[PDB]
Structures are given as structure tokens and as C-alpha cells.
Amino acid sequence: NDIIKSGLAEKALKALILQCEENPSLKNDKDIHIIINTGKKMGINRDNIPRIIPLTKYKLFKPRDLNILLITKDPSALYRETLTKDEHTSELFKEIISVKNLRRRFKGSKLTQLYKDFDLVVADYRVHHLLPEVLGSRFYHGSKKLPYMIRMSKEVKLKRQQMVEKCDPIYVRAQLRSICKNTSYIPNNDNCLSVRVGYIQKHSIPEILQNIQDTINFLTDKSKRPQGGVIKGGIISIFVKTSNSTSLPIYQF
């Protein structure tokens, strides 16, 4: 909580927010990211699978706020029918698609159109590794719209047995709520790391600060491994920036 107490973090966020209003170039910038300088190499190769960081105090977003794309295993009939009929998930997803249909209908410029229309992409964990070839490069550089791994039903796989195919609408909704409210991060085999902590015009500066403390606590807490506790050896420095703005330091060892 020492970072929250320091006035520097408060000062940096005030300057950053002020510029976005002043500067025409930063007008389309809406998200606030923190750049963390871990002391030593994380040693985790980028697997492009987001890891959820729980933000206890405040929620970044709600499922109803965003366009959500669900990519399901072939055939998508069982999942599309079950999710659409259920009252909890009848109106949760903008579109439900299968991998094979997704590859066929969207190619080239259509993939670019798909990128803009949807704010959040989620996919069955079974088909997550296929998406990089399908969705293309645009989805998979920058970390803004990486698909999230979700599980359709609570059934588990056992060796030498066949998993029963089911769709649990309440479980799917619960996972999506966690994804939206909580922030996320992707490990990489280098010092730098980027995490979204706030949204301009929606979170007050005290709220954005609290999200940073939750992010730092989770990433440094060894008890939260493997999802957390990835920053071993402390943090050399932390900055704050938008997509196109410059980095404002908020902590330095």
C-alpha cells in the first residue's frame, strides 16, 4: 500500500488524465496501463493465454458493457442453442461462432472488421491454440483483444475416458463476469510487463490507484502461483501510460 500513500502516483495520474483532454492525438486513448520493470527475467515464454488478476475492491467492467465474441468447438449447435435459450446467457454474447465457420467466413480484410466490432473475445479452451492461425496477427500483437480461455461446463477429462459434452449457462456467465471485472496479464520472457488498471472517464484516480495495488500484490505474492507470484525479486520501477502517451513514473526502487 506504500505506492498508494505516495503522492507521486497521484500526481502522475492527474497529469496523464489532463493531457488526454488537452492533446488531440490522445483523444482516442481511453485505457490506462502500468509498465512494470521486474528486476530479473520472468523466464516464461509468451503463450498468448491471458491470466486473470483479481481486483477485489473495484470492478473494471461488466459483461453487458462490451461486445463479446464466443468461439466454440465444432459443432456449435449444442452451445449456441443452450446459451441463447437460457435467460442468464440469452443476451450475454454478441455472436456465437465455431472455429471452422470462423475460418471460412472471415479472411483478409474481414478479419480487420472483426477486430473492430468486438471489444472482448472468448473461446473454448479446447480451440484456443487454433485461433492464432485463424484470427490472424492483428488480434495477437499488442494484447488488446487476445481471446480468453473459458470452460463451457464443469466436467473434467480423465485419461482413457471420453469427456461428456455439456453446456452450463450459469458457469459460463460466472467466468465472463470474472474476466470483465478483473484485469489480466500475459507473461513474457523479459523484464517489461503491461497490465490494464483503469479506464479514462469511468474510474476516479483513487480507484485507479487501488487497482494498481491489487495488481502489484497479486503479481508479487508467491502464494498465488502459478497465476500470480510471477514477479520474483521485487519491482525496480512502475510507470503509467495510455496507448499513445509517454510513460509517467509512479514508483522507482
Binding site: 503463450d47 493465454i49 491471458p50 491470466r51 486473470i52 483479481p54 442468464h88 479452451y125 479446447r126 484456443h128 491454440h129 480468453y148 480461455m149 473459458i150 470452460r151 473434467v156 477429462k157 485419461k159 450459469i170 458457469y171 460466472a174 467466468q175 465472463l176 463476469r177 470474472s178 474476466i179 478483473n182 502459478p226 497465476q227
Partner: peptide, 24 residues
């Protein structure tokens, strides 16, 4: 929860809590 076919599942699975399940 672990799936031998997909090791990537166990990391990066959305945590689910009681507040998430209860209807708004």
C-alpha cells in the same frame, strides 16, 4: 482443474466466486 491434453488450461482460468454466481 487440470487437463492433460491442454496444459495451458490450469493457468489463465477465470476464477469463479460466490458473488459471480449470484444473479444481479
Amino acid at each position: 482443474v487440470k487437463d492433460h491434453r491442454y496444459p495451458g488450461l490450469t493457468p489463465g482460468l477465470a476464477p469463479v466466486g460466490l458473488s459471480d454466481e449470484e444473479d444481479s
